Amino acid sequence: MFKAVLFDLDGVITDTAEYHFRAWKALAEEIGINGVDRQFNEQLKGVSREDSLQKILDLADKKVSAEEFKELAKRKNDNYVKMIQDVSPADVYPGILQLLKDLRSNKIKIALASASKNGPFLLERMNLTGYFDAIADPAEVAASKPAPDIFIAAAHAVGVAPSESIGLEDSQAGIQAIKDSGALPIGVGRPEDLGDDIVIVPDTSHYTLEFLKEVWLQ
């Protein structure tokens, strides 16, 4: 049986992937880049704040000063932080709270593997911090998603091998990070976006301990 579950946050625990998208789009448009639509944004999910800005700039072949780059990333984060102030426990995605209770029941470790620096604030907003055995700090890993390091670190933090862990993720970058860590990915979203080669569910109600069950056993 698997011994840990490694959770992405944005788009898995709650609908904050939508907020990051709206904030990145607004920022891109402020600098004249209009190509951040939902399809492009699939490239930004699970990517770090600086990496995301760089992808947006690269899409446009745009160069900015180092001072401007720093201000832009800060500008987007300040906007996103305002956007998330009223997130509450009512915003937890369906299935998630029960999954956390069911896992703790069954002595299965729970770790956060979010690229977001705002993750601990969000778990507090949703009254979920007490479910987590560890939160992997994304500032502490040398490489961000799609590198596997955050997932490896999360598994480590709870004393469980990545090979004995399931990783939940809504993004292309994150699914790749889970594959490369040795953990078993179960994505949430559209196969059109996330692939036909792993188990993908349409929404988080599917993330039951029974199903993780089911998938692990094969």
Among 49, 109, 125, 179, binds ligand BG6 (CB under 6 A): 49
8 is catalytic: yes
Stretch that binds ligand BG6, among 63-71, 108-116, 176-184, 205-213 (CB under 6 A): 108-116
Among 13, 36, 47, 160, binds ligand BG6 (CB under 6 A): 47
Q: Does 167 bind ligand BG6 (CB under 6 A)?
A: no
CB of 213 to Mg ion, least distance (A): 23
CB of 46 to ligand BG6, least distance (A): 4
Among 116, 172, 181, 204, binds ligand BG6 (CB under 6 A): 116
86 is catalytic: no
- Do 174 and 198 touch, CB atoms closer than 8 A? no
Quickly tell me which residue has 């990145």 as its tokens. Answer: 24
Nearer to ligand BG6, 118 or 176 (CB): 118
Could you check whether the bond before residue 120 is cis, i.e. omega within 30 degrees of 0? no
Among 55, 117, 156, 206, binds ligand BG6 (CB under 6 A): 117
Q: Does 149 bind ligand BG6 (CB under 6 A)?
A: no
Residues marked as catalytic? 8, 10
